[PDB]
Amino acid sequence: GPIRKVLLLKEDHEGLGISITGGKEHGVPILISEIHPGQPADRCGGLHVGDAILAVNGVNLRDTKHKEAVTILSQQRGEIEFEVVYV
């Protein structure tokens, strides 16, 4: 599908509210496998199960290993911009 930019707003006491799977070591992008109800990703409205996370706040995630992506994603705070695509 088309590449999309999506804004997520998160408070500091919360996580992102997604599960991710995949990563470079598996030969696939970082993929959203779950959107947890009522948490920030669900609330933002623009992120879906099956989306590949291409970048977050300008950080490319296209060639990142799973745990690299976890560290990068979990470091983001506040107003967080995602670049995503559904294939």
Binding site: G15, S19, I20, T21, G22, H26, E34, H66, K67, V70
Partner: peptide, 8 residues
């Protein structure tokens, strides 16, 4: 399940 999954 071959791939890692993390809740974040």
């Amino acid at each position: 399940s071959r791939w890692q999954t993390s809740i974040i």
